[PDB]
Paper text:
CoV-N protein is a multifunctional protein that plays a crucial role in the viral life cycle. The N protein comprises the N-terminal domain (N-NTD) and the C-terminal domain (N-CTD), sandwiched by three intrinsically disordered regions (IDRs), namely the N-terminal arm (N-arm), the central linker region (LKR) containing the Ser/Arg (SR)-rich motif, and the C-terminal tail (C-tail). In particular, the N protein interacts with Nsp3 to facilitate viral replication and infectivity. The coronavirus nucleocapsid (N) protein interacts with non-structural protein 3 (Nsp3) to facilitate viral RNA synthesis and stabilization.
Arg92, Arg95, and Arg107 of the NTD β-hairpin comprise the positively charged center. Particularly, Arg92, Arg95, and Arg107 are also potential nucleic acid-binding sites of NTD in SARS-CoV-231. The SARS-CoV-2 NTD has been identified to possess an overlapping region between RNA- and Ubl1-binding site, suggesting that Ubl1 and RNA could affect each other for N protein binding.
Residue numbers in the entry: 47 to 174
Write the structure that this text describes.
Amino acid sequence: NNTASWFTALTQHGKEDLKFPRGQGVPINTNSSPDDQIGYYRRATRRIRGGDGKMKDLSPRWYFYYLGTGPEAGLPYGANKDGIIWVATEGALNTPKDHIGTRNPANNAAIVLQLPQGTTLPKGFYAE
């Protein structure tokens, strides 16, 4: 607890897991350096009780954590895990980003997720 993504989420409207072409997907953060531009998005599921007394699955959200941080801080880049997808800018260093760490919501609001010009969000994904 008291740990969160530095950024706002991507929402999934389709059936396919989030996926970026190699070199794309790392949110913009002016307080970070070129070496730091690598990590993962982790799926967060939500469901609520409908009018019919059955659980309704809402659109999955995906949140970015820098490599070596967050709920999967221990996973190396490329590790295969459901709900985890990897992104990296060319020339980012494969080193943990402990100097960036995660966000404490008591101290800092999320950075608005923004992707560098020319980036393609996959079908059905939107930055809310």
